[PDB]
Design a protein around this ligand. Structure first.
Ligand SMILES: NC(=O)c1ccc[n+]([C@@H]2O[C@H](COP(=O)([O-])OP(=O)(O)OC[C@H]3O[C@@H](n4cnc5c(N)ncnc54)[C@H](OP(=O)(O)O)[C@@H]3O)[C@@H](O)[C@H]2O)c1
Ligand SMILES: NC(=O)c1ccc[n+]([C@@H]2O[C@H](COP(=O)([O-])OP(=O)(O)OC[C@H]3O[C@@H](n4cnc5c(N)ncnc54)[C@H](OP(=O)(O)O)[C@@H]3O)[C@@H](O)[C@H]2O)c1
Ligand SMILES: NC(=O)c1ccc[n+]([C@@H]2O[C@H](COP(=O)([O-])OP(=O)(O)OC[C@H]3O[C@@H](n4cnc5c(N)ncnc54)[C@H](OP(=O)(O)O)[C@@H]3O)[C@@H](O)[C@H]2O)c1
Ligand SMILES: NC(=O)c1ccc[n+]([C@@H]2O[C@H](COP(=O)([O-])OP(=O)(O)OC[C@H]3O[C@@H](n4cnc5c(N)ncnc54)[C@H](OP(=O)(O)O)[C@@H]3O)[C@@H](O)[C@H]2O)c1
Lengths: 422, 422, 422, 422
C-alpha cells in the first residue's frame, strides 16, 4: 500500500496550488456526470439492497442502504451546493501590524492527505470526494462490504471526471478489498496520511485508537438525551419528541433517552404513552415510571443498566425520572457521549443553566436533536460529526479540513533583545 | 496517580463556570506574590544552576537555565499582560438564523484537563499555569530533573495563591518525581487528561507517540532554513542572519541551515565568512561552498549527511549551495521540520512563490526566524510552538487552549423531512 | 479658522503613519501627567462648580459638572485602559484570493480630522483626546461655556505632553471662545473636517443638521422605555427599575417611561409606589394608572401629551398602562428615540418577539438600561452614543473611528472581458 | 410624495421580519420572469437606444445604454448569484460575556428605506431591486430620461413578481417623472428615507449635498491615477495600461492620468506611443513629456491645467512626468478623487510605501484599476462605489446595506456604581 501513499502525497502538492476555477469545474462535471449516469448507480444500489435483504438485515438498515431517484437528485444538489460555496483556501483569518514593523497574518491552507474509513452508505463517498476536491486534499476511501457495488461504480465516475479535467489521477482513490488487514496496514501509514476520519460503532473506534499512529478525529457513537422540564407545553413537546425519534431512527443524532422531571410526570407520561402507541415505539421505562406507563397503550418493558449507554438504532426509547435539573445534568455527564442534548422548557433560568453546564457538541433549547447535520447547520455538506475536542467539533464543513499558516513580511526586520511593551 | 486525575477532573468543572473577575484576581495575586518573593526563586535557581554547571552542562544550557532578576521581572510582566487580555471563554465565534427558524451560534468553552511535559526551563511553569488559569483548564505539570528546586518553589507559590481566592486545590498540580515510569503512567490516563502538550527533542516525542492514548499536540524539534536569493542586499541579509543565529542559539526558532543561491554565492560567501568569524560560529559547509569558504577567516569544516536534520543548539551553521528557488523549496520540503522558514530577496515573484509553496508553520519574507514567539506574535504568552497540523499551529496562545460548542435556540422547531434550498 | 483646519490636516498625515509604540508612549505620558497635576484640575473644577452653583444650576446638573479625586483617578484608569487596548489601525478585516489571481484584503485606516462639539463635562475632553490619539486622528474640540477652566487646563496639559513626545503640535487643538458664531463657522469647514460628533440636546442637533456640510454622527437625546410583562417577578423588577432610574439620573441612558402590562398592573403598581416613595421620585402617571397610584405614598401627578417625548433629567418617571406586547411595541416605535429599551419578563416567546421587533440601538432582556456605556460594553471608553443608523451605532469605541481600505496585489493581472462564474 | 414615503415605511417593517426562504423565492421568480420576458426588454432598450442616437449621443454612452441579449443573460446570472449568497440579516458580528454577567452580541438588521438616484443604465435597476429585496429594505428608484422605457418595463416585472409572491406592494416603487422638482422634494423627505445613494457626476452630487437632510453615500466621480515606477517590465505595464484604458472607457474605474517616473520615461514613452496609436487613444501630454511623444505615431496634444481634475469618459489619457514616488503621491493626493490608484513596479519597498501612504477606496499593486467592481471583488453585485469615508467604502455589497444592533440578556442584572477592572 506504499504506492497508495506515494500517489496521494504527490497529488496533494499539485492540488494545493489549483485555483478555485479548476476545482469548481471538476465539481460541476462531477454533478453533471452523476445526474447523467443514474440508471447504472440506481441499478447497482438496488441489486446490493436486494442482496442485503437476503442476509436478514434490519429494515432501518436497508432504508439507510437504499437509494432512490429522489436521493440521487438530492446528493447531486448537495454537490452543486458545495460547488456554490466560497473556497476556504487562501482566506485570511486575521492580521495586523506588530510593534517591530512586521506585517502578520494567517492564511488557510489544505490539510494534505485525508484517509477516511466510513460505514456502508452510498452518499458519503460522494460527499467526502466532493469536499476533499473543493478544499484541495487528496483522499483515500475505504467503506463497508455492504456498499461495495455502489462505491465501485461511483469511484469509477469520479476518477473518469478527474481524468477528463486533467487533474492528477492520484487525487481520489479507494480500496475495494473488504479485508480488515488492509485497514490495520493503513492505520500505520503515518508518513502519508495527515488525518484519519473513522465513522462507525464502538468496535471500529476501539480498534483504530488501539493501533493508530496518525491523528484521528473520531466520529463517535451518539447517545442523545432529551430533558423535559417541569414547566413545558405537552402538545409542543410531544411533537418535538416524535420528530426526534420516529424520523430516520437509523441515524446517530436520534434521541435515545428521555429524562422527565418528576413534578410533570403525573400528566406527561399518560399522553406520551398514547402518542408513542400510535408511533409504535417500545418504551424501556425505568422502575419509577413503570407504574405510570403500565396502563398506557404503548408496550413498555423494564430497562437494564447497560441499556443507557448504547443506541437502539430502531423504534425504542429509554424513560427515566429525575428529581431536578441537577440530577439530569449529572446523568447526562455520566452516560452521555457528548453528541447532542436538548431541553424543552418555558423557564429562562433553567435554559441558561442547561446551556452553560452541558458540554455536548451541540445543545438545543426547545428544538429537535435531528438538527445536528452539515446541511441543516448552513454548511454545504458534512464528512462526519466530531464528538472529540481537538480540531473541529460537531458537524464538519469546508473549514474543518483546513489549517492556517502564519505569514510575516518585513523590511529586513530583526527581533530586538529587549521587547518593551505598553 | 488515579487521585491526580480525579482531582483534576473535579476541579475542571468548577473552573469552567467561573467568571473573568476571579481569574483576573488570581492572576494579579500570582504576579504580586512572584514579585514579592524574588529572593526564594533567585537563590533556588542560582543553586540549581551551580549544581548543574558542575555536571559539564553546555554554556547555552546554563544560559537557558539561568534566571536573571530582570528575567523574573519579565515573567511577572508577562503574567500581568496575560491578566490584561480579554477572556476568550464565552466569546461568540459566529452565528445566524437558519431557514427552519433555529438561531445558531458557536461559543468558546474550556478544553478541560490539560497535561504538559516540558523541558527544564523555569518560566514555562509560570506561563503554563497562568494560561491554564486564565482559560479555565486544570493543568498537570511534569518537568525535567534539572529544574526541580525552581519548579517546586514556583508551584508552592502558585498552589498557595489558589487557597487565598477560594478556588479548588486540584486546579494546578504537579509531579515532583523525575522517574520516567510515571510519565508512561500519565500517558495512559485517557479518561482524565483531555490533551497532552509534550515539549522536548525527538526521543521524548517518539516515546510519547509510541505509547499515547491521549490526543497530543507535539511541540516538535526545530530545523529552520533561510534562503538567500540572487537579488538581495548583502548588508541587510548579513544583519538578519546574525540576529537569527547569534541571539539565543539555544532556542528552537534559530536558523540551522543556510541555503545560498549559486548566482550570488561568489559575492555573498566571502562577506558571510568575514561577518561570521567575528561571531565565532563554525561553518559546516557543503563541498561546493568549501572552496569559497576556505579562504575566509571563519572556521569551516565539511558537513555530514545526517547533520542536515539536527539542531546544533550552539554557535554552528550549515551552508549549502542550491541551483534556484525550486531546488531550495525541494530541499526545505525534504529536510524541514515545518517550524520556520525565511527568504531574503528583492523580487516580488520569488517572494510570492516562496510564500505559496512552503508549508512551514511560519513563513517570513525579509525577516528573522526569531519572531516565532508567543509574545512577539501579539499573543500574551505561549505554552509551546505547535508543528503539527491538527488543532492549533505555530505559537499556541489563549485561543489555542479553547474549543467551541454549537448552541441552537428555537420555538419547538422540528426538522422537515424534505429540505428545499435556493 | 482656516489655519485651524490647515494645521489639523497637516498633522493628520503624519499621525496616520505613526506606530503603536509612539501612540502608547504619548498616552502613558498623558496619564502620568494627569495624575501628577491633580491639584490644578481639582481646584479649577471646584472653582467652576462654585461659579455655576451661583447661577442656580440643578443638583443633578451640578453633580455631572462636579469632579472628585475618585473621578480623576477613574479617568486616569480609563486612559490607561485605552493605552492597554490593541491598536485597531492596520488590522485586517478579511481577505481572500479572487478567481483572476488577485490577492484582496481590507485594512483599517484612520478617519482623518475629527471635529467634536460636546456638553459641559470634564472627562469627555480627556476621553476624546485619548481615543483620537490612539487611533491616529487629529481632533478639534469645542465644549460648553460652563467647563471653561477645566477644559483649558486639560488641553494645556495634553498639548504639553504632545510637545514633549515630539508629535506635531496640531494633533489636538481646541476653541476657547464660547461664541456660537464660530460653531456655525466650524460647521462649514468641509474641506478639513471629515466627520463631526455633536453631543447635546434637540436644539444643538437641529442647529447642526440645518447648517451642516460635513458628515454628522448625532449623539441624540435619550428616551429609554422599560416594558413590564404580565409574568415577571416583582422584587427583581423593582430593583432593576430603581437601579435604572435613581442611579445618576442626569445621564441619557436613564429610563423615562414605564410601560406596565394591564394584567399585572393591579399588583405591580402598589409596590412600585411604595418603592418610589422611598426613592423620592415623582410619578407622572397616565389617567388609567392615576386611580391605582393615587393611594400610593409616592407623589403622583397627571401626565401631559408632550411629556412622553423628552427627558426629565431628574427624579421623574412616566407611567403608562398598555394592553399587550403589540401596544407597547407600537408606543415605543412612535415615541422612542431609538436609544435603549428593556423588557422584564419570564416568557421566552415574548422576549424573542421584543428583541426581534424593536429597532433600538440597544435592547436588553431582564437588565437595566444603564448598561449602554463604552466602558461597560467591553470597549475602553466612548466618545458618544450614536442613535443614528449610518456608520457606528450605540457606543462608539476605537473601531468606530476607523475606516477600511481595499488592497489588491497581482502579477500584472488584467480583468477579463467576460467573467465566468460557478 | 407623502404617500410614497408612507407606503415605503409601512412595507419596511413587514420586510424586516421576512425569512430568507421568502426573499429567495421572490428573487428566483424575478430572475425567471426576467428570462421569460426577454423580448419586451430587448425591444424597449433597442427603441430607446435608437431614439438616443437621434440626439447625437456619444458612442461610449450608447454602448453603456445598449443592452445586448448577452447582457440580459448576464444580469439574470447576477440575480441568481445574489439568490445564492448567504442572508446577512440576523448574522452575529461578535459577542461575549461581560464582567457584570451580561451576555452581549451584535446582530445585523436592515437599514430601512433606501432612496436611489442613479444614471441612465438599465442593469442598475435590477441589481438595486434585487439587493434591497435580499437584505430586507424598501427601495425608491429615480432614473434618468434616457432610460424612461427600460426602467419602466423592469419595474413592471418586479412589481408583478412582488404581487405574485404575496409581499407588500410598497416594497419596490419608482418615479417616472423627469421633472427635477420631484428630486428636490425627495431630498427633503427625512422622516421616511433613512439613507440616499446618488450616482452621477459633479452636478448631481453638488445639488444633493447642497439641499438634503438625509444621510448620503456619494458615488462620486472617478479620476484613477496609475504610477509607473523606475524599475518595471515594459510589456506587462503596457498590457495593464491598455486593459485599464481601452476596455469599456465609459465607466468610472478607468485610468485618466498616467504618472511616469523621469528615469524610466525615455525608455517607456516611445513604446507607450507605439501601443497607444494602435489603441487610438489621444495623449494629452504635459509640456515636459511633449518632446518624446511628438515623434510617436499616437496623436499628442498639450494638456491644460483643468483636464487633470475630470474624467474624459472617452479615448483620452493624461501623461505627466513626476520626479519620484513622493512627487507622485503628492500629485495623487492633490488631484485625486480617492477612487482607485495603482502602481506598477518591481521594488518591494516602493510598493509597500505606496500602499501605506495613499488613501483611496482601492489600491492595487501590479494590477488594473478595472477591478473596482462588486462582482469582481467577490460580492454578488454592487449598488454603487462609495468614495466617501462614512459607512461603507469602495464597492457596496450586501453587508453595506445593513447595520448592527446590540443585544443584552441577563438575570435581572443591575449596573454597579463602582466598576472594578483588571
Ligand atoms: N458520529 C458520527 O458522525 C456517525 C456517523 C455515522 C454513523 N455513526 C455510527 O455508526 C454506527 C452504525 O454504523 P454501521 O451500521 O455501519 O455499523 P458499524 O459496525 O458501526 O460499522 C463499522 C464500520 O467500520 C467497519 N468495521 C467494522 N468493524 C471493523 C473492524 N474490526 N476493523 C475494521 N473496520 C471495521 C465496517 O465495515 P466492515 O464491517 O465490513 O469492516 C463499517 O464500515 C452507529 O453507532 C452510529 O451512531 C456515527
Ligand atoms: N517546539 C517547541 O515549541 C519547543 C520548545 C522548547 C524546546 N524545544 C526543543 O527542545 C529540545 C531541547 O530540550 P532539552 O534541552 O530539555 O532536551 P530534551 O532531551 O529535548 O528534553 C526532553 C524533556 O522530556 C524529558 N524526557 C527526556 N527523555 C524522556 C523519556 N524517554 N521519557 C520521558 N520524558 C523524557 C526530559 O526530562 P528527563 O530527561 O529528566 O526525563 C525533558 O523534560 C530542542 O530540540 C528544542 O528544539 C521545542
Ligand atoms: N446621546 C448621547 O450620547 C449623549 C451624551 C451626552 C449627553 N446627551 C444629551 O445631552 C442633553 C443635555 O446636555 P446639556 O446639559 O449640556 O444641555 P444641551 O443644551 O443639550 O447642551 C448643548 C451643547 O451644545 C452647545 N449648544 C447649545 N445650544 C447651541 C446652539 N444653538 N448652537 C451651538 N451650540 C449650542 C452647548 O454649549 P453652549 O450652550 O454654551 O453653546 C452644549 O455644549 C440631554 O438631552 C442628554 O440626553 C446625549
Ligand atoms: N462612483 C460611482 O460608483 C459611479 C457609478 C456610475 C457612474 N459614475 C459617474 O457618472 C458620471 C456620468 O454619469 P452620466 O453619464 O449619467 O451623467 P451625469 O450628468 O453624471 O448623470 C447625472 C444623473 O443625475 C441626474 N441629474 C443630472 N443633473 C441633475 C440635477 N441638477 N438634479 C437632479 N438630478 C440630476 C441625471 O438624470 P437627469 O439629467 O435626467 O436629471 C442622471 O441620472 C461619471 O462622472 C462617472 O464617473 C460614478
Amino acid at each position: 500500500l506504499e504506492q497508495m501513499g506515494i500517489a496521494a502525497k504527490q497529488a496533494s502538492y499539485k492540488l494545493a496550488q489549483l485555483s478555485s476555477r479548476e476545482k469548481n469545474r471538476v465539481l460541476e462535471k462531477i454533478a453533471d456526470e452523476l445526474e447523467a449516469q443514474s440508471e447504472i448507480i440506481l441499478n447497482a444500489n438496488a441489486q446490493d439492497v436486494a442482496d442485503a435483504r437476503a442476509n436478514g438485515l434490519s429494515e432501518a438498515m436497508l432504508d439507510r442502504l437504499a437509494l432512490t431517484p429522489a436521493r440521487l437528485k438530492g446528493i447531486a444538489d448537495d454537490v452543486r451546493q458545495v460547488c456554490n460555496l466560497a473556497d476556504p483556501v487562501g482566506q485570511v483569518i486575521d492580521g495586523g501590524v506588530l510593534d517591530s514593523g512586521l506585517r502578520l497574518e494567517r492564511r488557510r491552507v489544505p490539510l494534505g492527505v485525508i484517509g477516511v474509513i466510513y460505514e456502508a452508505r452510498p452518499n458519503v463517498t460522494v460527499d467526502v470526494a466532493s469536499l476533499c476536491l473543493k478544499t484541495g486534499n487528496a483522499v483515500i476511501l475505504r467503506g463497508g462490504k455492504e456498499t461495495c457495488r455502489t462505491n465501485a461504480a461511483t469511484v469509477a465516475v469520479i476518477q473518469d471526471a478527474l481524468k477528463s479535467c486533467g487533474l492528477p489521477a492520484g487525487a481520489v482513490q479507494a480500496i475495494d478489498n473488504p479485508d480488515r488487514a488492509l485497514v490495520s496496514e493503513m492505520l500505520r501509514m503515518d508518513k502519508y496520511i495527515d488525518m484519519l476520519i473513522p465513522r462507525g460503532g464502538a468496535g471500529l473506534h476501539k480498534l483504530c485508537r488501539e493501533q493508530s499512529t496518525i491523528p484521528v478525529i473520531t466520529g463517535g457513537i451518539g447517545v442523545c438525551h432529551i430533558y423535559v422540564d417541569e414547566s413545558v407545553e405537552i402538545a409542543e413537546a410531544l411533537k418535538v419528541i416524535v420528530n426526534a425519534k420516529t424520523q430516520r431512527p437509523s441515524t446517530c443524532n436520534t434521541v435515545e433517552t428521555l429524562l422527565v422531571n418528576k413534578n410533570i410526570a403525573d400528566s406527561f407520561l399518560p399522553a406520551l404513552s398514547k402518542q408513542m402507541a400510535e408511533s409504535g415505539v417500545t418504551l424501556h421505562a425505568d422502575a419509577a415510571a413503570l407504574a405510570q406507563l403500565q396502563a398506557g397503550p404503548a408496550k413498555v418493558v423494564a430497562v437494564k443498566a447497560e441499556e443507557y449507554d448504547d443506541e437502539f438504532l430502531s423504534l425504542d426509547l429509554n424513560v427515566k425520572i429525575v428529581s431536578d435539573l441537577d440530577d439530569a445534568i449529572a446523568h447526562i455527564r455520566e452516560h452521555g457521549t457528548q453528541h447532542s442534548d436538548a431541553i424543552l422548557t418555558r423557564d429562562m433560568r433553567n435554559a441558561q443553566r442547561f446551556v452553560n453546564e452541558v458540554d455536548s457538541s451541540a445543545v438545543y433549547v426547545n428544538a429537535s436533536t435531528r438538527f445536528t447535520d452539515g446541511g441543516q447547520f448552513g454548511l454545504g455538506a458534512e464528512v462526519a460529526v466530531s464528538t472529540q475536542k481537538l480540531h473541529a467539533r460537531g458537524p464538519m464543513g469546508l473549514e474543518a479540513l483546513t489549517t492556517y499558516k502564519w505569514i510575516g513580511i518585513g523590511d529586513y526586520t530583526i527581533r530586538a533583545h529587549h521587547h518593551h511593551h505598553h
